[PDB]
């Protein structure tokens, strides 16, 4: 039910990991849009950002590294 | 992929002015330039069937446009085919 940049418009960035940690659980898994309430347009962009932060070792793939 | 500066040359060369972008002479030449540019893309990789159908669409689109121009005015049709180098 919560909202995100669908209202406070900004482009999804893969570097500001402070906001990206709110959309991943403690295991590093991507939280679905059915829980956070984000739109599908930015959820797809968020998914690329999480995968990109995982590649650059800014966010963990999991906690079993 | 037929960028804006490439399209701006053809409309100013084949059309009456810079606004005559829809004429048959422009449309055939516009499609021909994309076909010849896509020849090098299909010179390689031998397997891009999805884009090849897109190439085959504008091949038939040029054929339909050329046959209309041939039926409409032969003088403009004969002038266009020698200008582009086609119609075996």
């Amino acid at each position: 039910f919560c909202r995100f940049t669908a209202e406070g418009v900004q482009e999804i960035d893969y570097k500001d990991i402070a906001t990206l940690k709110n959309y991943i659980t403690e295991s590093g898994k991507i939280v679905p849009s059915r829980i956070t309430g984000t739109r599908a347009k930015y959820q797809r962009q968020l998914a690329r950002a999480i995968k990109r932060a995982r590649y650059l070792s800014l966010l963990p793939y999991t906690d079993r590294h | 992929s037929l960028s804006t500066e490439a399209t701006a040359k053809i409309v100013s060369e084949f059309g009456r002015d810079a606004n005559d972008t829809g004429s048959t002479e422009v449309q055939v030449a516009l499609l021909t330039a994309q076909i010849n540019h896509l020849q090098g893309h299909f010179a390689e990789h031998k397997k891009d069937h999805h884009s090849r159908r897109g190439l085959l669409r504008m091949v038939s689109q040029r054929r339909k446009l050329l046959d209309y121009l041939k039926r409409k005015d032969v003088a403009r049709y004969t002038q266009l085919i020698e200008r582009l180098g086609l119609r075996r």
Binding site: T25, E26, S27, K29, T62, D63, R64 | -
Partner: protein, 65 residues
């Protein structure tokens, strides 16, 4: 995945395991791929889920309870 309950635990309280799967993905890839039944069992999953929602907005009968 990780749980501490630092000093005053005296019990597991390990609901963080079942908070993500703890059984769900490991009892799904231990067999039965088919490459097919994930399509069929998911088409009928939301087909019955929307009819439980269709009767959730169509239960307005008296029913004398």
């Amino acid at each position: 995945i990780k749980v501490r309950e630092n000093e005053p635990f005296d019990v597991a309280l390990r609901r963080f395991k079942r908070s993500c799967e703890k059984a769900g993905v490991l009892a799904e890839v231990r067999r039965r791929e088919f490459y097919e039944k994930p399509t069929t069992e998911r088409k009928r999953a939301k087909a019955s889920a929307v009819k439980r929602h269709a009767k959730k907005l169509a239960r307005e009968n008296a029913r004398r309870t």
